[PDB]
């Protein structure tokens, strides 16, 4: 690998904020916060709100209500 032409690259840990699911992957960005990791090693940490585990598609259960049909809306509004 050529020297002094690539952007900086460093190992970095990732935690799913919603769940805390943790994984180690390299990155170009740098995180001020650093955390430890099995094998007793510290790396910068990138907290992630949305990850594979967090996102509804991967889980298989979808948060959204799918809205309400107008028939049911009408029934509710007029008690029918």
């Amino acid at each position: 690998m050529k020297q002094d032409i690539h952007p900086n690259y460093q190992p970095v840990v990732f935690m799913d904020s919603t769940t805390g699911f943790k994984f180690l992957s390299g990155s170009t960005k740098g995180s001020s916060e650093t955390v430890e990791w099995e094998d007793g090693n510290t790396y910068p940490l990138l907290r992630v709100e949305v990850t594979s585990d967090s996102h509804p598609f991967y889980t298989g259960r979808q948060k959204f209500t799918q809205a309400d049909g107008r028939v049911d809306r009408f029934n509710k509004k007029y008690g029918l």
């Binding site: 990732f14 994984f23 992630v48 594979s52």
Partner: peptide, 18 residues
């Protein structure tokens, strides 16, 4: 190799949901 795996993993986890 390693860079390939790392980028694919990041793509699966972080990049795609966003």
């Amino acid at each position: 190799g390693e860079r390939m795996y790392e980028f694919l993993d990041k793509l699966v986890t972080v990049s795609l949901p966003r």
